[PDB]
């Protein structure tokens, strides 16, 4: 029900005096399908501990979205460290087209139809953060109406 899924796991090194301390880092996302998307990175000495810590971190700091019935109400562009993401409402289209490290996060967010493309360095963590920031910056028509004096 919590719609949890990780994206990639990578191992790191410390290069200590006695050799190398091989640790592990994770990347997980959590959601339900009506917003409430969270992410977690997670570090540990072992892969299972790292992914558990990533899931626990994703459990908190969960930010909601103002999604339409199955997509966004407007195209959006998200920018981050070295990754740029473009989202288009893409009505019907019997599904998404997004690629790695991005299709996972929206299938977690629950939006079935969306045109998602990534320009720039394809760092999973950076593209996920860019997508989260773009979703946060996205605004709903009801919100903009109440802000601006709808009169529509």
């Amino acid at each position: 029900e919590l719609q949890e899924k990780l994206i990639a796991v990578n191992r790191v090194s410390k290069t200590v005096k006695g050799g190398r301390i091989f640790s592990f880092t994770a990347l997980t996302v959590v959601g339900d399908g009506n917003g409430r998307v969270g992410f977690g990175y997670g570090k540990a000495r072992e892969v299972p501990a790292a992914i558990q810590k990533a899931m626990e971190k994703a459990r908190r700091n969960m930010i909601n979205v103002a999604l339409n019935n199955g997509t966004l109400q407007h195209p959006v562009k998200g920018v981050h460290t070295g990754s740029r993401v473009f989202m288009q409402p893409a009505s019907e289209g019997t599904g998404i087209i997004a690629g790695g490290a991005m299709r996972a996060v929206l299938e977690v967010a629950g939006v079935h139809n969306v045109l998602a493309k990534a320009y720039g360095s394809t760092n999973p963590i950076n593209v996920v953060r860019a997508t989260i920031d773009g979703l946060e910056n996205m605004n709903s028509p009801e919100m903009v109406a109440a802000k601006r004096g709808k009169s529509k």
Partner: protein
């Protein structure tokens, strides 16, 4: 001089002598000129006084356009009785492995300048083995994806 640059850069030669070898007319008449491929000849124990192994025959155009002359043909080293059992014992419990080094000529015989080289240890693969283990772990840990 056919110095065998591999055996020169690794495990310097220590002992050698002079002797010919037996061969047929197909794989001959080009060693008189000098062309050959004797880089790191893998000479191992053979009942016939450690028959020459490893080194192939020169790729000179003496081919009958089917094969060069002999993709794999018997090559015999020459020793009356001095190094069969001793060579077996040295390979077993010393670390010295006899390999062919050069091809000197008495102007008639293509001499097998076999050299008894020391078995040198491999490079520390203790980083790439762990890299491969991490790669297979990454390939296996992709289970929780739907």
């Amino acid at each position: 001089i056919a110095l065998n640059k591999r055996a020169r850069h690794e495990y310097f030669i220590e002992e050698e002598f002079e002797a010919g070898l037996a061969l047929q007319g197909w794989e001959v008449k080009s060693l008189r000129a000098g062309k050959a491929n004797i880089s790191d000849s893998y000479v191992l124990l053979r009942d016939g006084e450690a028959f020459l192994f490893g080194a192939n025959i020169t790729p000179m155009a003496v081919a009958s356009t089917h094969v060069v002359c002999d993709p794999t043909r018997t090559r015999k080293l020459l020793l009356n009785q001095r190094e069969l059992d001793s060579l077996y014992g040295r390979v077993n419990r010393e670390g010295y492995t006899v390999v062919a080094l050069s091809l000197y000529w008495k102007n008639a015989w293509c001499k097998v300048k076999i050299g008894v080289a020391k078995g040198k240890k491999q490079h520390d693969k203790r980083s790439d083995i762990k890299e491969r283990e991490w790669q297979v772990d990454k390939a296996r840990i992709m289970k929780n994806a739907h």
